[PDB]
């Protein structure tokens, strides 16, 4: 029948999760942001739509730092991005507290991944309305 | 409630006309065993603050990690993290003071005595003490442990009240600190000859000096000392 796109954790008959696909529409609607991997680092950039002359230039910062070595940028629902980064920061601190070393970027990527995936497992939460581009430098590049 | 195992002795400090000096030796004692000789007990925070810590070294290392987390956290979503919204000595201290008093109130202290030395953004000298009881106080000279009993008397001869501060120079202040470290090496049984010294100056910034040694010691008179009363040879 129908109604498969009303709850988050529900599989449609073709094996899809429509609420996640609808979250993608929120991202596609957002500002454009990018990442570029260079031969000893990474670069992030983002478009900030100036709605009016009243917006103070150079303030309203969108790119966020995690620990001291990771940058995150995202497109879509900005608050959802901040929420994700707050989690990332909690998660990076935990890793450093126990293991001393700064969190490697692959390790950090999965921490965000597992958290975002968790928000597709239950109907009592909605998926994240962002796609996040992030990275940095660690022990091996 | 606990007991200190690996310990650091005196931390001594004073302010001068343009800033503050702070020093502490490089020893981690284990009771009467002089166990570790490469222990840095001065913790710089940014370019304007040095925290000197005595007492339990395991707790010092925990406090050390708290301070690194403070710097990280302060830089989050903070475009002015290395300008107007950088950490002041006063913020570092008030944070530490809060923690020290909460831990004593939980009957589980950080078994330390801490001196935060620095220069605020407006140029003012910052020097304040806090310990395991959460007790705080400011003075033109501050010292922990044996330094309180032996260094303060010497340092107070240079800066006896607030008005002596603008009259006191870096050279005179540093010499007074260095002399006090020699005196502590003479009479404190848990002291080391090797120490670190840090100057924070409102003009010349943070100057951190490692691997200093007590020099110009007087011992020659010991040869003339024989017996304990009546013995002649």
Summarize the structure in words:
The structure is cut from a larger assembly and holds chains A (141 residues) and B (233 residues). In chain A, the strands form two sheets. A three-stranded antiparallel beta sheet of chain A has the order 3-4-5. In chain A, strands 1-2 form a two-stranded antiparallel ribbon. In chain A, a hairpin with a 3-residue loop joins strand 3 (64-66) and strand 4. By secondary structure, chain A is α+β, with helices and mostly antiparallel strands. In chain A, helix 2 (78-99) crosses helix 3 (105-118). Chain A has helices at residues 18-29, 78-99, 105-118, and strands spanning 33-38, 41-46, 64-66, 70-76, 130-136. Chain B is an alpha+beta fold and 233 residues long. Chain B has one domain: Aminohydrolase, N-terminal nucleophile (Ntn) domain (Glutamine Phosphoribosylpyrophosphate, subunit 1, domain 1, 4-Layer Sandwich). Chain B is 27% helix and 31% strand. Chain B is built from four helices and 13 strands. In chain B, a hairpin with a 2-residue loop joins strand 2 and strand 3 (19-25). In chain B, helix 3 (146-155) packs antiparallel against helix 4. The radius of gyration of chain B is 19 Å and the shape is globular. Chains A and B meet through helix 2 of A and helix 1 of B. It is classed as hydrolase/hydrolase inhibitor. Keywords: proteasome, inhibitor, carmaphycin, epoxyketone, vinylketone, Hydrolase-Hydrolase Inhibitor complex. The entry is titled "Crystal structure of yeast 20S proteasome in complex with enone carmaphycin analogue 6".
């Amino acid at each position: 029948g129908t109604g498969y796109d009303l709850s988050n954790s529900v599989f449609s008959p073709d094996g899809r999760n429509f609420q996640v696909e609808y979250a993608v529409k929120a991202v596609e609607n957002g500002t454009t942001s990018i990442g570029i991997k260079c031969n000893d680092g990474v670069v992030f950039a983002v478009e900030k739509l100036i709605t009016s002359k009243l917006l103070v230039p150079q303030k309203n910062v969108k790119i966020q730092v995690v620990d001291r070595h990771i940058g995150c940028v995202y497109s879509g629902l900005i608050p959802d991005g901040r929420h994700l980064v707050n989690r990332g920061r909690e998660e990076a601190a935990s890793f450093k507290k126990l293991y001393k070393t700064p969190i490697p970027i692959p390790a950090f990527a999965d921490r965000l991944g597992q958290y975002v995936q968790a928000h597709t497992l239950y109907n009592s939460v909605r998926p994240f309305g962002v796609s996040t581009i992030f990275g940095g430098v660690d022990k091996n590049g | 409630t606990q007991q200190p195992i690996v310990t650091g002795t005196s931390v001594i400090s004073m302010k001068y006309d343009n800033g503050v000096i702070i020093a502490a030796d490089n020893l981690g004692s284990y009771g009467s065993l002089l166990r570790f000789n490469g222990v840095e007990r001065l913790i710089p925070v940014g370019d304007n603050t040095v925290v000197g810590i005595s007492g339990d070294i395991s707790d010092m290392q925990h406090i050390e990690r708290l301070l690194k987390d403070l710097v990280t956290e302060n830089a989050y979503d903070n475009p002015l993290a290395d300008a107007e919204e950088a950490l002041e000595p006063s913020y570092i201290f008030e944070y530490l003071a809060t923690v020290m008093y909460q831990r004593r109130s939980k009957m589980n202290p950080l078994w330390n005595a801490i001196i935060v030395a620095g220069v605020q953004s407006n140029g003012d000298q910052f020097l304040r003490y806090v310990n395991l009881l959460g007790v705080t106080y400011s003075s033109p000279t501050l010292a922990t442990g044996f330094g309180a009993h032996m260094a303060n008397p010497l340092l107070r001869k240079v800066v006896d009240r607030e008005s002596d501060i603008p009259k006191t120079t870096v050279q005179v202040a540093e010499e007074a600190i260095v002399n006090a470290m020699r005196v502590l090496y003479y009479r404190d049984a848990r002291s080391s000859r090797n120490f670190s010294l840090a100057i924070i100056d409102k003009n010349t910034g943070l100057t951190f000096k490692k691997n200093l040694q007590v020099e110009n010691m007087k011992w020659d008179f010991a040869k003339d000392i024989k017996g304990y009363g009546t013995q002649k040879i």
